[PDB]
Design an enzyme around this catalytic site. Sequence first.
Site, PDB file in Angstrom:
ATOM      1  CG  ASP A 205     -46.908  -1.086  -4.768  1.00 21.91           C
ATOM      2  OD1 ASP A 205     -47.672  -1.177  -3.690  1.00 21.91           O
ATOM      3  OD2 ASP A 205     -46.892  -0.285  -5.227  1.00 21.91           O
ATOM      4  CD  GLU A 231     -45.168  -1.791  -1.278  1.00 19.27           C
ATOM      5  OE1 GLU A 231     -44.164  -2.456  -0.872  1.00 19.27           O
ATOM      6  OE2 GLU A 231     -45.275  -0.874  -1.737  1.00 19.27           O
ATOM      7  CD  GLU A 259     -45.982   3.412  -1.558  1.00 20.18           C
ATOM      8  OE1 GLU A 259     -45.483   2.514  -1.380  1.00 20.18           O
ATOM      9  OE2 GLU A 259     -46.521   4.279  -2.501  1.00 20.18           O
ATOM     10  CG  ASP A 281     -42.037   8.454   0.583  1.00 21.99           C
ATOM     11  OD1 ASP A 281     -41.269   9.423   1.120  1.00 21.99           O
ATOM     12  OD2 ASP A 281     -42.299   8.131  -0.509  1.00 21.99           O
ATOM     13  CG  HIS A 308     -41.710   4.930  -0.877  1.00 20.96           C
ATOM     14  ND1 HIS A 308     -41.034   5.835  -1.558  1.00 20.96           N
ATOM     15  CD2 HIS A 308     -42.609   4.184  -1.824  1.00 20.96           C
ATOM     16  CE1 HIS A 308     -41.604   5.862  -2.958  1.00 20.96           C
ATOM     17  NE2 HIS A 308     -42.205   4.926  -3.002  1.00 20.96           N
ATOM     18  CD  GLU A 328     -39.621   1.061  -3.113  1.00 18.46           C
ATOM     19  OE1 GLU A 328     -39.879   2.131  -2.181  1.00 18.46           O
ATOM     20  OE2 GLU A 328     -40.556   0.512  -3.858  1.00 18.46           O
TER      21      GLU A 328
END
Lengths: 384, 381
Positions: A205, A231, A259, A281, A308, A328
């Site tokens: 990430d 990501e 996200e 998200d 997310h 996740e």
Amino acid sequence: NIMTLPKIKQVRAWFTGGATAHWIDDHIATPMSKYRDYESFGINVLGTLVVEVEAENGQTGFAVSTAGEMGCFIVEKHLNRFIEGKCVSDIKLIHDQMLNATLYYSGSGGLVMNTISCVDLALWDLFGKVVGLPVYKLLGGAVRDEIQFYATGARPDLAKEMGFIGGKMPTHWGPHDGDAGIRKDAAMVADMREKCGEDFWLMLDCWMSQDVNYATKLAHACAPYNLKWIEECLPPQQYEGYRELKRNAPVGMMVTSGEHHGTLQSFRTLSETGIDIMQPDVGWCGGLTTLVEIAAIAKSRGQLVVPHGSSVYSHHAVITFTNTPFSEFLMTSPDCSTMRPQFDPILLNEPVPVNGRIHKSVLDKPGFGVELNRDCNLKRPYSH
Amino acid sequence: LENIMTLPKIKQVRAWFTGGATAHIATPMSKYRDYESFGINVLGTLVVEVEAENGQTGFAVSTAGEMGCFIVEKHLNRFIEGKCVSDIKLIHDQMLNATLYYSGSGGLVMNTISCVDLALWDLFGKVVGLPVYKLLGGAVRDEIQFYATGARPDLAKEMGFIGGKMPTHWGPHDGDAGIRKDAAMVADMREKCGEDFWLMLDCWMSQDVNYATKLAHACAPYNLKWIEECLPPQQYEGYRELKRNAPVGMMVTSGEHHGTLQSFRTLSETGIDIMQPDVGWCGGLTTLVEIAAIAKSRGQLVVPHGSSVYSHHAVITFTNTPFSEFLMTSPDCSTMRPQFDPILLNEPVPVNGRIHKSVLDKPGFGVELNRDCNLKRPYSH
């Protein structure tokens, strides 16, 4: 014959933590890393927003997100007029009135959208609890018996021992660190590969901290270790950058983002850049109502959507997406070793993955199946 | 070589708010018969004041209100205080990157970042003793020519303006009747204003591609100069399609609700003729100047939204902005009232549709804060 549904009587907003109230606090690369004094930049200024919708029969629904006091302002001084007096089933209507009523100042994401999202979730919670069904059943039921999770934290090796299917590590260096930064983050991935074996997934990430060239070099330096995906390499507005990065990404390696993107239209644009997986998200993209539309456009493209990790708010959604084969879970543990509820302690009876999974029977409870812990430092900044 | 002018550090930054929820125009909400109201005045005004260690101060105003004060007093202050009054670009970048995770690249949070940027430029100019337009490289024209925004283009013409922008009154849900009525409105104004006076329609994000296309063509016989902001800002693809179907010679514009330089890059690539950033929403003067440059690099005009002195000092320096905008905040649109009246003291207004540069020859943005307004200090630090 029809079940009698009550009207919503009032909506309340509180906030905890924030401006007016560990591995994550360890040299994590962000857009601010560029600055030594911020290598601090106020990542915890907003605090948590909690929205509660009360029906005329006393039943209530709620949700939490990142917005805090300002979020309470938006809810108590603006959105309430579109919420109160509505049927508990007018979820899509309220959602649309909120998006259009705040279009002039929402910026299609961020603070204002997180707030709109929280409301949407609180409405879905209420409706499900009024009807007596879990949200995932209202949406059309589960398409799998359990949700499989990969874990986000600094210790993929520990996450593997805990039953997760993969581990996502954050980058520690950025563009200003050049070849050394790439070398160090790549070595980190190489070490975890060594320790985790071949079948355990590894991901990086980058939290909007890179540019196209740095991201490209980093992805290729990690390709020998089969990094599954890289990501959020760039700020969300850089769609063109994402298109170029995707074109230069190692073959077979995926590029993801999302996200920090908001509104369905933004995701349409994002999807057209070519990235492999969008990661909205629920608490930032616009809410459950929007998340479900985002899942659909990815599916129409024959692509996966991997939201997310948002605890129960995400669980009830992803278990119903034939398009989301895994989800996740954030390791909010200082060393990433224990299974602590993500929204602990604001949420009561919040489930956690066991053997890296959460069976649907666990989600078989009204709405999102959790209750508000009113013993937190909840503050009521505004009223109406 | 002489000794460099000594510059002070900024001591503190404060924020207040006036107006807001705590103190037949077509819109995206028009489709709901109960809001065609929807809280267009909920934010109120944000005022940011930056004080230097020598007592000198600079300020600016925008739309953000109480929440804006939160952002300023609880977050951005750490990037502002202790900096040199000349560290404008630095502070601006630290703000954009520090709030990237929650700014949404525009709206409320960007309006706030913008206000700060403007207040910093005001301070610096007042510390140096020069108007902002001179710090930017000077004027490229002796006066700014204005078109007016209001319901009476005929009156604006009598007042010396070069054009008049009218808002649409109907949307997609009104169909052919709505198009017919807004088109007739333009036809009437053309009749009354003559051939050389410009006419424009502002659609305030209330339409879709088909409705916008039909409306533009229905107005083409009356030489509408441009059709503005037909779609929500995220609909870049929609803008590209609309532009392709627009009457030949008629321009398509947008941008007052777009934020950050990168968004404008994307917007520019859709093919629209003119981007209309608002200094108080696009990110501030620092960002506006970069936006002007990409339009120029494309051989295109940039026509910022009308923001009083905050816009004036910028547009007079853009070889790329041959005219600007002035909002008729008058109930009937008949008198020249300062746009930010009364929060701003000594705010200039166009005369004969123009504002000469001599008028802008004052430190910073050349105005002073009217501390007799209902200014509130919600937070401190």
